[PDB]
Amino acid sequence: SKPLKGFVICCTSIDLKQRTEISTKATKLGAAYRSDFTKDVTHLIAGDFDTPKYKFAAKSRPDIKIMSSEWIPVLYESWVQGEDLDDGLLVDKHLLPTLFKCRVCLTNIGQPERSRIENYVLKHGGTFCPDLTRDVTHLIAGTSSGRKYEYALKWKINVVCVEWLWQSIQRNAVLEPQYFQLD
Ligand SMILES: [Cl-]
Ligand SMILES: [Cl-]
Ligand SMILES: [Cl-]
Ligand SMILES: [Cl-]
Ligand SMILES: [Cl-]
Ligand SMILES: [Cl-]
Ligand SMILES: [Cl-]
């Protein structure tokens, strides 16, 4: 029984302990493992969007499935427990949310735009942040002015136009901020 025949798996933003567990179980399941992001990679297991590997997959590898860290351990346990593994291999259930680990704040944006943006952020696995804090990942700004904008620059927080959100959603992955800079 080799369920994951044809699968080539790579990890990013995963701790060594879980990474070893993943590589071990994935190999048992019949998959190939890669330390480097090579061409034959089919599945990227990610714990963050803010890595060279994730960014590469986002801009150049639309064919690659971005997976959550819990995919392999769950699939492996189901295998061992004698459960019948259906065609799909729990991939769809364990696809990483598009805005995983994104913490989105807004400025210079009115209603009902503000309400609609929050709607799509929550729907796609992100966190909405009414006030700006240092752990905010993206500030969506209508204009380049005001207290939030200035603190965003000072703290080196991504400042993007709303198109960042729409195209990240379309792509099913977080896109890099410079493509959506304010003019
Ligand atoms: Cl890693
Ligand atoms: Cl490798
Ligand atoms: Cl690499
Ligand atoms: Cl999603
Ligand atoms: Cl906000
Ligand atoms: Cl757009
Ligand atoms: Cl796209």
Side-chain angles (χ1 to χ4, degrees), residues 10-11 35-38 52-53 56:
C10 187
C11 291
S35 294
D36 296 339
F37 202 164
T38 65
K53 284 182 181 178
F56 180 79

Side-chain angles (χ1 to χ4, degrees), residues 11-14 19:
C11 291
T12 185
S13 189
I14 305 294
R19 204 185 311 130

Side-chain angles (χ1 to χ4, degrees), residues 12-14 18 44-51 54-55 58 66-71 93-104 120-129 135-138 158 164-165 168-169 171-175:
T12 185
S13 189
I14 305 294
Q18 191 171 22
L44 180 70
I45 303 180
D48 205 327
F49 60 85
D50 190 28
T51 65
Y54 185 102
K55 291 174 184 180
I66 299 176
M67 308 299 304
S68 82
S69 57
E70 306 302 333
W71 173 43
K93 185 177 175 60
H94 294 94
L95 281 177
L96 198 64
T98 290
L99 307 179
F100 181 76
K101 272 188 175 181
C102 288
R103 298 176 63 81
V104 182
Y120 292 102
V121 163
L122 286 176
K123 153 73 181 177
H124 295 276
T127 302
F128 189 83
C129 308
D135 60 10
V136 162
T137 66
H138 297 85
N158 294 328
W164 166 82
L165 181 62
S168 288
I169 289 178
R171 171 61 186 81
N172 298 309
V174 174
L175 303 181

Side-chain angles (χ1 to χ4, degrees), residues 100-150:
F100 181 76
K101 272 188 175 181
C102 288
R103 298 176 63 81
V104 182
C105 186
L106 312 180
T107 190
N108 296 319
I109 296 198
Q111 295 279 18
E113 284 76 12
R114 174 174 289 268
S115 177
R116 295 302 301 183
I117 289 172
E118 171 167 7
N119 167 260
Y120 292 102
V121 163
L122 286 176
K123 153 73 181 177
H124 295 276
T127 302
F128 189 83
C129 308
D131 282 6
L132 181 73
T133 59
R134 290 178 171 265
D135 60 10
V136 162
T137 66
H138 297 85
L139 176 64
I140 300 178
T143 53
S144 46
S145 67
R147 166 168 278 99
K148 286 189 181 177
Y149 177 76
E150 296 296 335

